Amino acid sequence: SYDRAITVFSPDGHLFQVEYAQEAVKKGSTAVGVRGRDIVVLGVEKKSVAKLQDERTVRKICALDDNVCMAFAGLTADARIVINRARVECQSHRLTVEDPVTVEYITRYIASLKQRYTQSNGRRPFGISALIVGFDFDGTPRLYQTDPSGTYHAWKANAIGRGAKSVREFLEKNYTDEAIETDDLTIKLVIKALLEVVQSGGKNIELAVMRRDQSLKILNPEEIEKYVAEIEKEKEE
């Protein structure tokens, strides 16, 4: 079996393979996630807008479970692998512990898997960064990310992929107690965050929403267009 140490410490203490996985993440499509009072919203940029494609097959927001869902930036196939293992682990935890997985538990599992690939023999780190959202059993919304290095943190709102810094600055300047008062305000906040980096509005936005005791809902293009129109009127004033 292959046992070369792909990820090794470089001088100055950098793990180059992890940094390169992060660079691959930086070239992925922008993904934004915002945690509201009673709704959690995930949004992804679609550079692959090409019209000869089945939108169902390139979804970048996947439901890890009935109460957990994630969006990724980076390599698509590695994201598929991590999503599949996360679903398997969710179902295993539900058998063994009787209860639905908390968001932080599956986030820890995904982070541990990425870190293990960072340090195990003969495999490169996962070139994906995630945004694991969902609701806990006690009704507390959550939002985490998992970088390729394996570090996971909780965020009120974050962006991964290209334009992460721009959208992160926008969210810093535009995440207040009022901006997440209602569901529509959260939807519009995520859409406005994406519009800071997407080429054209509406057509390049994939937006999924999760609220209490309801499964993930993929907002259809018509709803995205009507929301974007609402931001257009709001910006006019």
């Binding site: 292959y2 046992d3 003969g122």
Partner: protein, 231 residues
Amino acid sequence: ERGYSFSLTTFSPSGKLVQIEYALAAVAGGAPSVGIKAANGVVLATEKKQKSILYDERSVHKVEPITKHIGLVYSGMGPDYRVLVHRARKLAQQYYLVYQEPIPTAQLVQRVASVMQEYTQSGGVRPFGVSLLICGWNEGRPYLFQSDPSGAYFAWKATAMGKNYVNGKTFLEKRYNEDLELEDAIHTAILTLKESFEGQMTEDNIEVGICNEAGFRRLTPTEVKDYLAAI
């Protein structure tokens, strides 16, 4: 003791497996081998130009039977041909044990090609340096195949491989048609070998094998003498 676990064959920046190209170069540098699919058989011919009279021509053979109805010839590195012949015999026997029917020639070609593919991608190994011509008669129809070092198999009606293989292919292209019987195919294969043969070609410096309804068999030197005299 543990072998390397990484592919020696990898994609070049041009987008091409250079090791397979170099294996094909070794194939193109070997003794010419020709195969002609007649309407009632197929002939496999190659030259046995030993580099001294000291070599015993009957000691080693380049046209090796695999089953009672399949034979093969190569153009490249002899030891790799021996390895692939042994593996093809193993695969044929496994098929016979499973299905109690002689292995179809297409199936044997597919399995040999799978072995070649394995050696193209597996760790610490180099691709085989032989292209095979697998001949067989089954389902009342002659067959002729060519398996390049990469493991890609092509159905052929007539082909030449080795030195002057492009000129031999042009020769065959000019002088092959559907209605050839086995004897005409043998004559044409001998002429194709002659087209690149250097010096006088005799019984012991060419090896010819045929397969028909009666099955596959190497032509004995006396029969090759009879066919050579016909020119």
